[model samples]
Target: CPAPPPGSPDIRAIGYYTDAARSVIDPRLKTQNDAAVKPLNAFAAHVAKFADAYAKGADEAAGRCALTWLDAWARSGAMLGRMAHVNNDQSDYMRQWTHGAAAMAYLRTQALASEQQRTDIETWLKRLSAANLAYWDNPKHKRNLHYYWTGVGIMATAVATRDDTLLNTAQGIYRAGIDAIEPDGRLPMEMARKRLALHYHDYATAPLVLMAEMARLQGEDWYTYRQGALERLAARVADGYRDPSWFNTQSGAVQETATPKASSGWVEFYRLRSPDPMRFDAMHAAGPFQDPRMGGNLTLMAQEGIVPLPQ
Candidate 1:
């Protein structure tokens, strides 16, 4: 592990935005935003490098590499404290996804880890989950994609550490998001993005799918949860990738992208779980979708096999 970068019990980050809707970037804050998140990004890249490698068969060395990096950070209490600057609309949200990235990395490689290593990492992951939970459980924006991101992160840590108690909490967040989806598959909160409506709808669908998949691993049927509301959301988002007319009509603004990519980390899992994968031919056209916050190489991980996941 090329000497883990400076560990921190807390992180500082600032959101990049210039509008109340938060749909536009000021460009002026680009430098500050990048600089503030550099450490957190480095942390994620470190885990992604090794966790991703270990997922693809470099198990022994890569596994140890993953452990060493996580262990060092865990011992140092990295990201175990204040998700600095929530008032500033920054690091608070950043930690939610970062925790998911770390927890998912641990989930992928823990099969190769030693007992002590697993224990240490699990402890750290739970602590991260707990801290993120504190913020997201009563989030400022309760009915948004942001909360679902936290739900997926919490679910990842819960499954990774085998903490059944946390599972209930994850379910609550998942259901809350489900409640927001209209029967025809509109997520009103995401659609509020106007020109970015379709993008937000697609972006928001990712964590919900992950939460459902993780729930399945735990023997809970979140896919069909709440009268299959998630399926409706999935159906709409998938269709929107091909045509954005519905979103444009609802948001009253032409979609920012003429044609959205049908591919995403969540769509990879959706296709496999879906009854007819061919229905997503357009989605499959785009190969190798990844979301570092979940699994680094989602398509390959599913296709190449994972580290023997939880039962």
Candidate 2:
């Protein structure tokens, strides 16, 4: 998997492209390839393992794990190029995913890590956020899932470090995503995914929900931004998940079931704002939030109350 390792290309912009049309990057198909997904999965797993170790009161083990990954990443200097994809050389997408994991890891383990280890992770997290900002901030690109993910990573890092600039930048991007939604509750870019439109709409909501939760922790009410756009989107997705006819009507395709990638955190976050027994049951049915890219242990983190660090 992972496109046989692009092996350090000259240009490392980081985006996805299609086999049929290689000129422009295709976000959906970019990392979906087994080649791509396999490595990404491994990468996320590594971070999750480190976070779990930290979460379970194994500070020393977690610190060792964090340091190991940090050292490996620094040595690889894998951030410099776009060699991961077949046609595209942009690692922006991968950077966002990795950045989110790193942010989550840092937030989970920083208090337990050595000064040097904490410093190393913070430095890397900032670098990752900067790399993401370089592209996502580009005026050429409109607000979309990539932008949301970039904010998700940066917002997490900002929360970990209590950095005002990073938090504000991330909030702006998050607000832009909120502002980009149509009154009908469809995200234009995700809606363009055709049959996968609703799937992506759901996908896109995860990061927004995560960001809002993080913002809530910081005493900001991001959930109510844009006249409760986030709530509207969540409600729409829940409805679509049960009956995709609305999404099908919009995408002009007969939809199947919702993507299993749906996160319980979405439901959990929504339930905090609006009490819905149906959503509560749906969250249990879908299971706990286990995705590492979503900062793992979201069943604990994705809430309004304060969660203490592992003793």
Candidate 3:
């Protein structure tokens, strides 16, 4: 493998310093948050090392190192979320989805995170449940709110709480967004392509599947309707994914300008549906998930592990 950067410690010193600083902020949580984020910091460190090596033109070594780091790094966010939930640090309530997204991004972008990522996500669900704030408890907020973020709020709460009332609330919010989706599941916002529809998969499914999972947790038949609908729609639209021969039409026929969107976005869906051995085949075919620097960092994540924020 490429030689690690000059003055680069096998372990990252700066990340440790950041964790130590954050721990002092909540001395009471010294034992709590500190213990949780330490692994995250370690994970971040590997990413840095791998990045450094690749920046110096070490592609082969970077790839190998990245593969090792990412495998382990994939598991850290869910682990932290689990512990944070157990410790009752729900203040950063948005972290449930954000952390889960972070974990998935590395693997899809890197082509090396499936089994561990799924396990981590399952653990995250449990932790997310604990950290979930019960918004449906407030009938006023439940009935009055019917917007996008509000819907995501409801969905997040539903997933976290697994409560029927919250699922119902989320369902109401999703209906509000119907104008945003088409009969074919093509999202108008993603079609805008401002950022290449990067946020499409998440913004759309968070509400529906969030509600479905919540209902499922309650032994309700949410999958037959809500979750199942989303899955079918995903499968139908999935064919458009970078298949030049297919007439998906999203990508321009223009050679230079037409950057066909890949199905990497649906990896999360496959994961939610369960046991996708081919989930990342598309991403792998696209080559290293990132530039040399990012690729190295991702590799280190697989090899080393993830470090945490603060104590």
Which one wins on TM-score?
1
- In the range 1-311, model 3's lDDT, one tens digit per residue, is 43322211111112121231121134555445455445444444455455444434425455346434543433343333222223333323233333333222232223332455445433543343334334334454322112333444335334433446656755655554544455665555443433233234334444344334334434665555433445543443343344323222442231122321222322332334533425335533443222221122332332232221111
Over 9-116, each residue of candidate 2 has an lDDT whose tens digit, in order, gives: 122344465533222346666555445445555666676666765665646676467656654564455454443444443455667776787677666666666676
Q: Which ten residues in a row have the lowest lDDT in candidate 3?
A: 8-17
**lDDT for every model?**
0.76, 0.67, 0.37
Model 2, TM vs. native: 0.82
In model 2, where do residues sit more than 4 Å from their true spots? 1-32, 36-40, 58-60, 82-90, 262-264, 275-277, 303-310
Better by lDDT, candidate 3 or 1: 1
Candidate number that wins on TM-score, 2 or 3: 2
The 10-residue segment with the lowest total lDDT in model 1: 302-311
Measured by lDDT, the strongest candidate is: 1
Better of 1 and 2 by TM-score: 1
Regions more than 4 Å wrong, model 1: 86-88, 137-139, 258-263, 305-311
> What's the distance in Å from true for residue 9, model 2?
10
